[PDB]
Write an enzyme that holds these catalytic residues in place. Sequence first.
Site: not given
Ligand SMILES: [Ca+2]
Ligand SMILES: [Zn+2]
Ligand SMILES: [Zn+2]
Length: 169
Positions: A76, A84, A97, A119-120, A123, A129
């Site tokens: 975004d 993410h 990514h 952090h990623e 995941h 979280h």
């Molecule tokens: Ca952004």
């Molecule tokens: Zn992606």
């Molecule tokens: Zn996160």
Amino acid sequence: FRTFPGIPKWRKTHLTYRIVNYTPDLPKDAVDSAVEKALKVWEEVTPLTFSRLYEGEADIMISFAVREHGDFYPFDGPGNVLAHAYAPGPGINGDAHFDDDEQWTKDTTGTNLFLVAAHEIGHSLGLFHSANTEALMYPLYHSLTDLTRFRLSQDDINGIQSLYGPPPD
Ligand SMILES: [Ca+2]
Ligand SMILES: [Zn+2]
Ligand SMILES: [Zn+2]
Ligand SMILES: [Ca+2]
Ligand SMILES: [Ca+2]
């Protein structure tokens, strides 16, 4: 801590990673370090190990992207969503990514790569979280100036060991 639905986790102890591309924001060896540093954080409190691939599909594929890249979740622009990643599994699962519309830094003068990477990759290893504000898995990216003080919180340790246990010996 919190784990994904049906507790997805790697059924193997040795995982492979691959840095697909590089951001214009940083020298190449600063991206490698950030990633390998982020891996160390998790590696140290579990029997998990990692090796690097430069071709083929690695369990954890890492890449920098802008807006619409190879999936149903386009980035975004500046700020807000920084990056993410997908929970354990084949294909894009485990993949991480990173949004290049952020200014990735080795320090805290923009979006610190190591911190978001750590952090990623959380995941990627099956962690969701946390509700604990002092935890790495807590959804709040602070401009944590004091990287010098960073320490994986016991909550994060608890959560990753719930899936993979403590180190062998
Ligand atoms: Ca952004
Ligand atoms: Zn992606
Ligand atoms: Zn996160
Ligand atoms: Ca994968
Ligand atoms: Ca940028």
